[PDB]
């Protein structure tokens, strides 16, 4: 399960996030941690560095102290408070003052539960410390940002991930091609968890990791096929386009959201006029809405391939 | 009841899914099963291979261990946990290490129930194993795909099913024609359960299995007749269309839902403009609603044939 | 109560359904009954033949064994299971192997209750047997059609019913005219229960059964009056049409659904263009909906007579 | 409370319904009652004759046997079955064979509850009997009409009620004018309960019962005021019309349905062209729908006064 | 808290409702009360007179007997029945026969709970009595109106309230101007509770009660300013309108609901065509929804001022 | 933590709110406080003045008496009532009559909890006093406004905050530019907590506080960048605009709501025609809705940049 076997071990090993880590290192020399707020897209390293941050400060004895828990399971903030009192009365065994709790998905709670943090902040900043992961900082009520040093994780980039992916491979006897690497990244959206997990799943199978084997495992169309489907649509061949999208949707087994996602990506990365690209995206915006309201997947989608085949003349 | 009497017995006997089985065989030589995730359309062999997978690993004593249960019945995940503890304490009687639980309709649960799997995965991977059937992989939250080897079942194809259908027949003294076979497949949508079940139902009756007898059993007009009815409607011949739909609705004895279903299928598979197909489906969407609210079958339906015969000019 | 006093006694006596009975007879010579599925409109003979089927196989002792029960009363499938165990342990007293249970309105249950049939099918096919009545076959989940020989009851035709109606009369000293017979059938929709019940109600009164006395008892306008009302509407005389529909609706005392029904019938059987007939039916479709949602009977109806009187020029 | 103090005592005393009673009398000479079905508008005498029918057959001891209960209170059909067993075991004390139960609002139940009647019909037709009141016969599933002698109550009429109203008055020292009588009937819709209740309420006040005092008590607007409001609307004076409808709606305190009802009545009884009357009623049909869907009373209503004030030129 | 300190004490002191009270007095000379039904807008005196009615009949000992309770709290009709039995067994201490229970918000209950009143009406009309407050009489099922003397409270008129308001003031050392009185009534909607409460709140502050201070306390723009904002919008000056609505929304500090409320009031009371008023209200309906779903106050509101400034040409 | 270190100490020190404070001072000379109601946007000084009001009346001993608590935590109104009885029995130690309780977020409670205030108002107005903070006065049921002197806090203003911000800086050795000050206020929305907190966070970093460093810390785009993105969109360069919005959305890490917010601000503060600004805001209104319903962030947003690039010609 590659995405854990390559969980960074020191802050130095979390890549793409110099911005955050360069200054997050300046908290290990002094041994200070004010409640951390980690913001960013998923699969970029919030949990990783919050491990490698607890790992660089305790040495060998992190597992005993640090604990990760999902903050959106609404009845457990109050049931995991006895872990707050045993954990605050125990002094870091070795030669350190403070101790850490990680809280994934913080930005899912309404105003209320958020407060309960505070009566363990001013009472435990000489013992306890929180790291709060959230998708966006905007979504955490101010009275907490107030007591937090904030870190905005940016989506990692191509070469930095591509490198790390290779290292996960050479060290695990997996043979990716260049094709399957580049493809493993189209997939990833710049999200490691997604990327690693995929690779892992393609590694489990028989040997060579082709561009395809990656497209198959994640159920996301070859980008060549999309810009075929969109193209054969724009030309005027509706029934053909419908055929493709069908075949396509069964081959990998994508959702309507999933198809509309790729439709988007490949509508953007088309080399067509900014004048027309709008017309497409606008409608695509429309269609994506229709779906989320609960309208019929098949009909709205085919109805969008219809949209394109009017723009023939 | 043919669809069980021909339930594949070994992985070798599940057809059309080489892609999955070829490598699912490589789990019987080594006797490894990491929690399996089966994705695909219904009636393609998820349950079948998950039986024939448990059957090829236990030999004669599968029934005692393996158990299938529907995962969407929301109050029973927790009531069928005592089957998890008797089943994990009993070592596979014979000479095998591990044991299996199949979970149909996994992709119906919201984030929560999905987690409860995990505290029996790391505690039972030296005793228990799960196979998860779902319509689409996209619909299972990542923390599970994480611990799963994934398999995307594709819809079985024409000739592969047509063959198996014949074998079910010659071995059960049923006389299908070529017509009734081809028709038994229009019906099937590439879904065996649907196909087998139909055949079975046509076999129960008096002898020869015509194209018709299949269309009747599934409630269901010759697709030639629909695209006739829709067409004679679009031309402007309302009274003619109404006649057809009537005759049609008595010949096979379809519901309003049933008619509106086929209306849909054949409105999609029309070779007409994406521009117009919308107008039709939109209204069809409307009509289908009207019916479910309890409006009058005959009037809303004829009122839809009216809709089409305005679009003459 | 004529509709029982003339309940067919042998399969030979159920008329209009040769299609079903001709081959349902071939189950009395061999003494086989695989679970029967009876599909068709109401008042066509599903219950009748399922009696006359149990009557032709037990001779004199059917009442003791066979029992009819409505399957839509949701808490009684499980309370009438002790009738399943006393009934399966008792061997048909005489010289027959098997026994019957009739289940009206089967097509009202959601997927679940339907299954419970099965654990008495494979355990009781050497003792028990089910006959399932339903409006449409399409509405019974496949796993049951699977184990059923299916029979589609068609709406009994004109002459076959007209004959039986006369026999009910000559044998009950009722004087119908030809007018009142033909009218008793316009009413019936090809549904005996409806027809017999009507006749019965017209017989209770004073002597001669006119065309009218039938129209009055069922609360259904002379078809001459409808095509008058629709016509005087189409001409442009709104206030006149409204008068008629009023008088009309009090004379027989029809519902809004009832009026809209006849409106439909006589809009179809008009000898007017297929071009215009649509406009009418479309709106009629509209109006019928408005009513079922709970809108005001009088206003929507008069508002439909309005609709027609715009189409003057 | 006049509407009870003048509850008819013998079938002879129920007026306007000769049609029903003339032949309902022919059931007291023979002492037969097959389950009665009473259909008709409300306040026309279904309950009355079903009392006066039980009163003419038991003489002095009806109250002990006969019981009226509303059939739409869904959990009480089964709780009032022990009244069915004490009532069927007790033989009519005196010299009569049978006993009666009245069931108001029968046409409110879905298919199911209706059946439960039957297992007390064939078991109690030598002891029990049902009288079923319903707004329309069409709304009672056939298997009951089957076992019922049916009676369609027509809306009483003017002079028959007007007479009875006077008798309620002379015998209660109330001074209605001719104006207030005629008006007491515009109100009534041919519904006694409505009429009597109104009169009663106008009698409670100070002396003379004017046309007005009746219009005021029922809030149903003076018909002069409506055709004022509609007129000042049609002329073009929107703000004036809105004022009236407001004042009007507070003076009597009508619902939106209630206003739209009177709007209708007085739109019909306008002496304006059949050409225009349509336009009005059509929209009124529209508006009435909008309301029943739950749209805003005030806005749709004023929005209808808007509609009229466009038709100025 | 002025709205109680000036709770009328005798029927003579409830103003604006001569219509009701003049004849409600004729129930204190005779000492009769048939179950009262009070209908009318809120804040017009239903509770007040139902107090002052119980106060004029018991003299000094009303509080002990009479009790007010909200009838919409669905589980308490049956829990406050033991107050019905202690209250019916105790004879009015002094020299009176009967006793009273007030039931606010009666018109919130579905058919069922309403019945339970009746088995304490015929059993307690020689001890108990009910007064039922409801917004509209139409909304109380007939079987209760049946046993009720009905009273329709009209919205208290201008001068009658304006007088009472002054008396509340001179007797409490508050200095309203004529402006602040007239304004205190624009506010009131003819609803005292609303009016008194407002006045009270403006009295608490520093001295003189201006037109403004009243508009501010109730949140609520000068109606001149709204029809300015709406107007400058309709003309085409969007940026101007946005400015106003801003200034406006800060000056008084209204919610989005509050603004949309006034927007409505002044859209209605515009002297513009019924044709256009619709367009506005329709969208306003739209906007109000958008807000309640949680959309952005500022953007939807400005987006509505946008809506209006398209309708320039 | 600047936003507390500069918590105003006397009413004189709360800026921008002369309107409220000028007359709130007239309550310290007399030593009267009727229950205060503080209405206004967040971060404008409700809590501040309610501190500085308690601070100007007790001198040195406020902390002991006054207590602030959030009123939306629904189970604690009743658990913090024992703080009401110890606090009401203790007379203000020194030479004052009365005592204070502050209640933030009052406008979150449904009708019920609001009442419980009252039985401590008339029992404690010679000991206790409440200050109620709420976003809008409209949202507090009248029976409380009734007993409250009301104060509408307006959003502070530019120069008053800008001054205080500078003082926080010169006294903390922070070097803001004019750019970073003006920007620190675009951010603030006129909300100090927001502003101070931001400044604080930019001060923690390396020296000079640029316009940017402020835009970065709050994850709110440079207003120059928005009106670039909107502009390059309006010109017709869709793909360019999409690029910007992307880069932009990753640089600061804004939500969809957050982006749509700034989109709005800078659409307003554009110097473009009132004619076009509408078109933009209308759609922006649309888009913002789409998002809140749950539609796809990326697609609706890009779909809005599409919208703008159609308005090229």
Curated annotation (Swiss-Prot), chains A, B, C, D, E, F:
It comes from Archaeoglobus fulgidus (strain ATCC 49558 / DSM 4304 / JCM 9628 / NBRC 100126 / VC-16). Keywords: ATP-binding, DNA replication, Nucleotide-binding. Belongs to the activator 1 small subunits family. RfcS subfamily. Signal peptide: none annotated. GO terms for molecular function: ATP binding; ATP hydrolysis activity; DNA binding; DNA clamp loader activity. Heteropentamer composed of four small subunits (RfcS) and one large subunit (RfcL). Both subunits interact with PCNA. Pfam families: AAA, AAA_lid_RFC1, Rep_fac_C. ATP binds at residues 40-47. GO terms for cellular component: DNA replication factor C complex. PANTHER family: REPLICATION FACTOR C / DNA POLYMERASE III GAMMA-TAU SUBUNIT (PTHR11669), REPLICATION FACTOR C SUBUNIT 4 (PTHR11669:SF20). The keyword Mitochondrion does not apply. It comes from the Archaea. Gene3D superfamilies: 1.10.8.60, 1.20.272.10, P-loop containing nucleotide triphosphate hydrolases (3.40.50.300). SMART domains: AAA. One of its GO terms (biological process) is DNA repair. InterPro entries: AAA+_ATPase, ATPase_AAA_core, DNA_pol3_clamp-load_cplx_C, DNA_Rep/Repair_Clamp_Loader, P-loop_NTPase, Rep_factor-C_ssu_arc, Rep_factorC_C, RFC_lid. This is Replication factor C small subunit. Part of the RFC clamp loader complex which loads the PCNA sliding clamp onto DNA. The complex possesses DNA-dependent ATPase activity which is further stimulated by PCNA.
